[PDB]
Design a protein around this nucleic acid. Sequence first.
RNA 1: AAAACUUUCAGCAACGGAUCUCUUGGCUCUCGCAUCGAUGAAGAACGCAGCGAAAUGCGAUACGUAAUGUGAAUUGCAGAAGAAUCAUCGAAUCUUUGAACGCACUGCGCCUUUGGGACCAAAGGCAUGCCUGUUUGAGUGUCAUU
RNA 2: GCAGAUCUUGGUGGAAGUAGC
RNA 3: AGAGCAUAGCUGUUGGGACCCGAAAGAUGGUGAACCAUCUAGUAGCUGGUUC
RNA 4: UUUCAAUGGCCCGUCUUGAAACACGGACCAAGGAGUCUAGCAUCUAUGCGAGUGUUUGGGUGAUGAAAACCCAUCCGCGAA
RNA 5: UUGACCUCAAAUCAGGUAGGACUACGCGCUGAACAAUAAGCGCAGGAAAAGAAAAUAACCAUGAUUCCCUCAGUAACGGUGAAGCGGGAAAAGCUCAAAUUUGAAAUCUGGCAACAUUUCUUUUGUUGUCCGAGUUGUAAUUUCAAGAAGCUGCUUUGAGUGUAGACGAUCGGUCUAAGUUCCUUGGAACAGGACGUCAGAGAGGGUGAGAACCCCGUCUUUGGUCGAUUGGAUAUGCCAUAUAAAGCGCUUUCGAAGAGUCGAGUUGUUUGCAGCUCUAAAUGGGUGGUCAUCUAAAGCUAAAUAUUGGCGAGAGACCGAUAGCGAACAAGUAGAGUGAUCGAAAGAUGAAAAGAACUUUGAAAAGAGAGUUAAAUA
Lengths: 116, 91, 120, 125, 71
Amino acid sequence: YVKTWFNQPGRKLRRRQARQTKAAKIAPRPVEAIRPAVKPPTIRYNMKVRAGRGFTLEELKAAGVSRRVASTIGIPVDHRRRNRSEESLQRNVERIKVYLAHLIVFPRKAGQPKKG
Amino acid sequence: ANPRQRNKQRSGKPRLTRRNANKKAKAKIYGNFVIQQNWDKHATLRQNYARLGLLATPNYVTGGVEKLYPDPDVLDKEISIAPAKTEVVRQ
Amino acid sequence: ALKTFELRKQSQENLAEQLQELRQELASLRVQKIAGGSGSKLSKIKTTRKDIARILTVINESNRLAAREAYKNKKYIPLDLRQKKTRAIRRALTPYEQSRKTLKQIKKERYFPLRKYALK
Amino acid sequence: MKFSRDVTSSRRKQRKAHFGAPSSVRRVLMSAPLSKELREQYKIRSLPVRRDDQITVIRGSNKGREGKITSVYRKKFLLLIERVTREKANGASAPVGIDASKVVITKLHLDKDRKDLIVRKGGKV
Amino acid sequence: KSHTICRRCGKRSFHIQKSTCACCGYPAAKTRSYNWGAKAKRRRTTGTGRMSYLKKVHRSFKNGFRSGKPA
RNA sequence: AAAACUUUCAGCAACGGAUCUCUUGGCUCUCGCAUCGAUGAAGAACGCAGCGAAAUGCGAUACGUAAUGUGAAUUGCAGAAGAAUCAUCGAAUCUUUGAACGCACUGCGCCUUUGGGACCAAAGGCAUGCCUGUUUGAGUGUCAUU
RNA sequence: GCAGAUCUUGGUGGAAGUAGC
RNA sequence: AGAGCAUAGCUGUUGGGACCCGAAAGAUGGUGAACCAUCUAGUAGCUGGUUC
RNA sequence: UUUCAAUGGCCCGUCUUGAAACACGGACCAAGGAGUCUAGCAUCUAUGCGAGUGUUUGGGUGAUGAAAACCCAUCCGCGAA
RNA sequence: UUGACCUCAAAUCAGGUAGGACUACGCGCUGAACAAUAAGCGCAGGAAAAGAAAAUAACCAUGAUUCCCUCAGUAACGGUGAAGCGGGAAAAGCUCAAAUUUGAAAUCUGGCAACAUUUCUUUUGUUGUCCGAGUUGUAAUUUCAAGAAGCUGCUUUGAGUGUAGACGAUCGGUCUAAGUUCCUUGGAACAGGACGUCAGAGAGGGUGAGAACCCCGUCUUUGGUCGAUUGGAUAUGCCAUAUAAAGCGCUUUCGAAGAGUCGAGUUGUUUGCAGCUCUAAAUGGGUGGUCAUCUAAAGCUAAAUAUUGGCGAGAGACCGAUAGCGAACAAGUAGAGUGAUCGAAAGAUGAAAAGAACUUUGAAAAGAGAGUUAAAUA
Ligand SMILES: [Zn+2]
């Protein structure tokens, strides 16, 4: 049982081509969703900062975005992560606020029945 | 080699060919007509988003971005939007 | 050598009539070819076989179009009138019923659908 | 240089295509040039050969001697020219074959399909 | 003699006393495809026949298994 | 000692098929795509060409028809002049068999319909399990029921 | 990169016009 | 008052089918004690060979 | 080059045996035919950098094959203690 | 009794569906040698499986799964041999059971009738009615991330039908630059010299020897053009059953949580899994370190990943007829075997067949003259 990496330049170009069709389908929105900033859970890397999965419910409510719409404007949700330190709430709320600063939202046509 | 591959190689039927290989050609843009019109058909999406004033990824680039030329108390506060750096974003 | 466009411009009984005697010279060409034939006749039998196929094709296709017209917009139709793509396709979930959504998921995608956002 | 991945550059595959081609693909492989004054009259460069087309042989032992094309022998890529023959042992004539890209077409056989082909490729009569 | 012609496989390997073909395990439904007989598979698989039907689905997949008459 | 015979070397002719040149083949890697069958698949057998030895192709509409094109060739001959041992292809055709399906496996049937010129023939179907439903009847049912 | 491997494959002799049929 | 790290080569060594050839196998699964196919590149201190 | 004249020279390989003796293998010719491919370790040398070092998991990119080349983000390995 | 309801059957009762084939990748059961190994058996897809924590961890804590790199040949075991961490690819979340709609089974298949609709007279729907299914529970609702209910005051909205254009995707036709000028050798000029031309085209092949300019192509094409077939958006017409339905907010009212399962003893298999013996709980239960985390015994789910098969495609410091496939060809073919199985040898006339007329000898087979060819030393 042996594996060869001859398709390594083939697979990389397939991935790039897979990104370009995604960009074609969804033009204005970025090819990647926003991710939060979290700290690795170990004494070795705890002083580091990296990306998370999504923004917890305290990070959404504090920033001012409901949890239902957040999934629609590209902000992802992590029901499992929680905020134990306020610096973790702060680094990710401002991460949301800077995102909503640059976020153009296209209006959608809405059904308007004659009566009500 | 295989029987199924070999009987139709000897036979007289034409091979079910498909001239599908268009290497190096990118996916043409549908969706937003504005960006399609300002979409360079040759540049990569990281190059075209940048040229159009759009962020391809709000998350950190995991690599080395191209250098073509030799380049020389707050939870209540709100970020007062971001002015568009290009005409096309203003469009 | 007859042509099909004028063959389809008549009723059924004469095509069956025109099929029957065309069979007749087919054996006459056959019985003459086994007792000694010429090159011209050796192709006439080939032409005869091709033309009876043309008659059979014309009459059969009108028979099917008769069934489709007869069974148009009927709930059930004979197994040979139906589609023949692949057994897998005929056992697949139809486009409509694969589009079925619960009223929970209908409310979700009406009030909070995906948007067309963009970043600067 | 070829750039399309739809085309191939293989001696094995291109020869497989050449000698595996059927007649409706061989009718384009057997084309012929046109005489210079006729080439500019219709503004077209080369046209496929056809029976009853008046041509002049340009290469080979039969260079210069003109004629028509009695019948195009597609399965071996040959043109049969009347009066361009060979004396067999038995005194008969086994007409030699000339390839379609050697002769030059002087007078075409004007069919209705040929006229459309001329005007289809930006030409005129 | 101990073998006759098998009506399903067509190879003279149909035992009389056993009433079973050894070349293809007649009259059972599932045929006798033993892995260690690799050379026996390449003798007795698709493409050693004609695949008159399977050569029709291969062609019809290109246009999408469509049906009807042209305009 | 010459011939004969034996021996070496050269010329020439056989024998053999190496070498050299290629090459509609093999192998290897990458790439794109999703498609069999009870609407009878894969497989097998028997057939079929103006004549085929294999070989492909095709199914009594047999080396295929319809349709869309191309526009004059097939070619060892024949053969017609919308030709074509052509292409495309969405329509029909698709022999006996085979999961193989009336019972059997050659034969023997059954049922219904069509008809022949009461009987017979042909056609259609007549395989099992399971699912949803319809009708029919029955259980030693549970009742119901004055 | 061959002289061997009772080496693989093909070819070819003596034996031999012998055993013989 | 640190001298390594990385690439390439050479020779050496340990595994991997392991310079090449050769020991009854055995096991699984089949076919009509026999036979077949694979696992298998099963096993060797030994034998024969290993090229200017 | 063939041949002759004079002088000479025990069949080659293996194995055996100090050595032979041997016993093997060899009818002849052509072609095929056996330290190779790979991971690990250590050594020597060559090169680049040097308290550093290593782009090729991946991303960016590459219009003239685009499986090459070119570029660097976050780690990480081995050193340094 | 009637007749309901329950069971029991049958029917050529209508509508269905299953089987076999392939098997490179994939999911199971099972298995000896030499190791979840071959095999054997079972079941699938364009991927399969897995999957939104009864998951880690002891941190400033992370956060579905899958693959890659490292962690690492490390811990542990006794040479076998990982997992968190980290860094990348990709990302998407969800549906039930447990609630009285109870001021109204609100749900659904089937028959029939019209209306439509189409890759399509071959598809797929709606409306109406009738009958069944169903109260031993079909819809809405809610899934622990919560949520139900009352309240408040802000923000919201189509499972329609066209037309029109733009954009894309797949199939098809189509548009496309220049020497065959002179001289020499040759059977042949594609060669050698000379004079030119084109080039977004000097890839490759053919053509009677090495052809950018004779022919097919190639480049333009990361495209014009003409058709059809569809996809997600935009624009706009019509229709909207909204008395409705959501999000956030506030709560003097609430908050259901999957059993022969977990767990124990015991026995097999290779820690889990399986049989047997027993067999539970409700701040409980599992797992880690009095704490932390998680919430099993029900369900689905893209993409990242695999691919010795199938439909095609492009290449190669690969083999070049004892090689490379067993097969460059009549190749799993002849042929061998009762049988399962086994299984080859075999490429090159020449530019053109011009394949040797004819005379002659011979019963012919063939030979000798003679002919073709550049050459029959083809
Ligand atoms: Zn059989």
